[PDB]
């Protein structure tokens, strides 16, 4: 009984930044995310399950969404997306489309376009009920360099504040 206060809900494997190490290519150092294997005292490895929200954000940013219908067409196998979206019930798509920007001159317009796309795609974190106020701060024009820091606002696993305007996220058990 009284023990109750701890959800029996668990978390599955989570993709993590720099799980497979950096990859230098003389332009900089990338992250190459993947799955982190946590070892034990006596063999018995196990996949890690931390940073759930960042895991969803990586799953969203780093997967191509469906392309838009053009008169040119697409190769049967290049039109992006996931067939598993045919079975979900929330009536949404899976992935992002930052890599589908219609490039143009005057890189300020390209920056604004990428901002719009990244924000529209990351809003699915709030729509799923995992964060509350995800937001981006994409600001640069350089030659082509761009910085795109992302903030994923979260909660705790026990409602400690009374009288909020919104409504507790539906999945505040991941701790966001």
């Amino acid at each position: 009984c009284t023990v109750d206060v701890a959800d029996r809900r668990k978390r599955f494997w989570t993709t993590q930044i720099a799980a497979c190490g950096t990859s230098s290519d003389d332009c900089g150092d990338c992250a190459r995310p993947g799955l982190q294997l946590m070892c034990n005292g006596q063999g018995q490895v196990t996949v890690s399950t931390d940073n759930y929200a960042v895991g969803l954000a990586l799953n969203i940013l780093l997967t191509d969404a469906s392309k838009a219908d053009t008169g040119c067409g697409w190769t049967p196998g290049n039109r992006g997306g996931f067939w598993g979206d045919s079975f979900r019930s929330d009536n949404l798509r899976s992935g992002s489309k930052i890599r589908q920007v219609p490039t143009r001159t005057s890189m300020r317009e390209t920056v604004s376009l990428i901002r719009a796309y990244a924000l529209d795609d990351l809003k699915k974190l709030v729509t799923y009920g995992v964060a509350k106020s995800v937001d981006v701060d994409l600001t640069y024009r350089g030659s082509n360099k761009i910085d795109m820091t992302v903030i994923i606002q979260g909660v705790d696993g026990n409602e400690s504040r009374v009288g909020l305007t919104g409504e507790r996220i539906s999945n505040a058990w991941v701790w966001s």
Binding site: C72, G73, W74, T75, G77, N78
Partner: protein, 112 residues
């Protein structure tokens, strides 16, 4: 070294697509599963993936075109190769200055 198809066949397919698609569009990069697909080449897939990824990057760096299978169909199971990096074999300038002006094969047609 273990390419199934005779090489000049796929070379001709690549050259023909490049010559025939960029007639009035001289900026179109011939690369990708749509714009750089060689429909006239059909290979059965292989247990090892030819160029390992390390060699793929090695060739990318040294101004070499690389073709790979489009769909992952499994062993056997006919497929079709497509082109990455529609680039020329240009990596240094006349005075030995690393450049990327004439790297993209579209930059050359644009200069013309």
């Amino acid at each position: 070294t273990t390419y199934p198809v005779l090489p000049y066949l796929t070379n001709a397919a690549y050259g023909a697509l490049s010559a025939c698609s960029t007639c009035n569009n001289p900026e179109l990069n011939i690369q990708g599963q749509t714009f750089g697909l060689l429909s006239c080449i059909n290979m059965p897939e292989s247990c090892t993936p030819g160029w390992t990824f390390g060699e793929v990057t090695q060739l990318q760096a040294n101004g070499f075109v690389v073709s790979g299978p489009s769909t992952t169909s499994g062993q056997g199971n006919y497929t079709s190769p497509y082109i990455y990096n529609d680039v020329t074999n240009y990596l240094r300038d006349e005075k030995n200055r690393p450049n990327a002006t004439f790297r993209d094969a579209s930059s050359r047609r644009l200069a013309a």
